[PDB]
Amino acid sequence: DPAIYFKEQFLDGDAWTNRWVESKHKSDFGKFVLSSGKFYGDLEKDKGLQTSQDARFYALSAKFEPFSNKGQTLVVQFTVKHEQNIDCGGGYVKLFPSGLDQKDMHGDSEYNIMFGPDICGPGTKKVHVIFNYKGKNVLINKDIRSKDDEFTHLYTLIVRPDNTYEVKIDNSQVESGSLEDDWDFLPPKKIKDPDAAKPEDWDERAKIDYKGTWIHPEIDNPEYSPDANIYAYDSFAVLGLDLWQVKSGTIFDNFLITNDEAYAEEFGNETWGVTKAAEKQMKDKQDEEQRL
Ligand SMILES: [Ca+2]
């Protein structure tokens, strides 16, 4: 059976304000509002948290039973919908450890993992996969492209006990690999020898012998060691929405934190998969109704 650590779909009207907590680190944070937007799959179902104010920082968070991903898979899933035609704005989530003051959440609050799309002009159009490791928030070496249109898109991060990850957009893989490879967590395995130097007596000839070419010998880095527990965090307790938007209107929906890939895939088919086709159809009616 799959452990559902967190599931949020905003289905019981206003009762979401009991689960979600507004930060007070700043006086002028933006308002989140329950909304399904101007076009949708289903009026009631596709209701989520919409950013309501232009040029504002955002800070809302939801807590759940503290758990650890030690020895098991972690899956973070949600849908983002940039209904506004977004110029610049984050669409990512943050997973925090235990002992976060929800009422004090800001950009510098120490998180475990940040995952999701970030857009700022044509220049920045990427999915962030950031792990907190030994005091450093390390960004993925892989350039993953985020979605920029007005429709709902599903973002999924899978993290496994064997230090492997996967990123899915719309239930299809876009990036894959191992944590050690696609981030710079560890020091390089093979440094150059700090005890060696040329040979001004080195002979670069093969005249008609003593040969080779001077390649500075590499040794094992004494301060390198494998870390099998990179994937592992001692506690996740809070999912935070900590963002900056210029043009507001982004709807977040269908959050899932789980330990099961199959369930996350199935839940995605059951949520984004149900939305996308009725959503596209409604926009097409509004757009042809705008022209003709
Ligand atoms: Ca919903």
UniProtKB/Swiss-Prot annotation:
One of its GO terms (cellular component) is endoplasmic reticulum lumen. The modification N6-(2-hydroxyisobutyryl)lysine is found at residue 47. GO terms for molecular function: calcium ion binding; carbohydrate binding; complement component C1q complex binding; hormone binding; integrin binding; iron ion binding; molecular sequestering activity; mRNA binding. Its main location: endoplasmic reticulum. Keywords: Acetylation, Calcium, Chaperone, Cytoplasm, Cytoplasmic vesicle, Disulfide bond, Endoplasmic reticulum, Extracellular matrix, Hydroxylation, Lectin, Lysosome, Metal-binding, Repeat, Sarcoplasmic reticulum, Secreted, Signal, Zinc. The keyword Cytoplasm applies. Residues 1-180 are annotated as: N-domain. It is found in: Endoplasmic reticulum lumen; Cytoplasm, Cytosol; Cytolytic granule; Secreted, Extracellular space, Extracellular matrix. Sequence repeats lie at residues 174-185, 193-204, 212-222. Disulfide bonds join 88-120. The keyword Disulfide bond applies. An alpha-D-glucoside binds at residues 92, 94, 111, 118, 242. Ca(2+) binds at residues 9, 45, 47, 253. Can be divided into a N-terminal globular domain, a proline-rich P-domain forming an elongated arm-like structure and a C-terminal acidic domain. The P-domain binds one molecule of calcium with high affinity, whereas the acidic C-domain binds multiple calcium ions with low affinity. The interaction with glycans occurs through a binding site in the globular lectin domain. Monomer. Interacts with GABARAP, NR3C1, PDIA3/ERp57 and TRIM21. Interacts (via P-domain) with PDIA5. Interacts with PPIB. Interacts with SPACA9. Component of an EIF2 complex at least composed of CELF1/CUGBP1, CALR, CALR3, EIF2S1, EIF2S2, HSP90B1 and HSPA5. Interacts with CLCC1. Belongs to the calreticulin family. Calcium-binding chaperone that promotes folding, oligomeric assembly and quality control in the endoplasmic reticulum (ER) via the calreticulin/calnexin cycle. This lectin interacts transiently with almost all of the monoglucosylated glycoproteins that are synthesized in the ER. Interacts with the DNA-binding domain of NR3C1 and mediates its nuclear export. Involved in maternal gene expression regulation. May participate in oocyte maturation via the regulation of calcium homeostasis. This is Calreticulin. It comes from Mus musculus (Mouse). The gene is Calr.
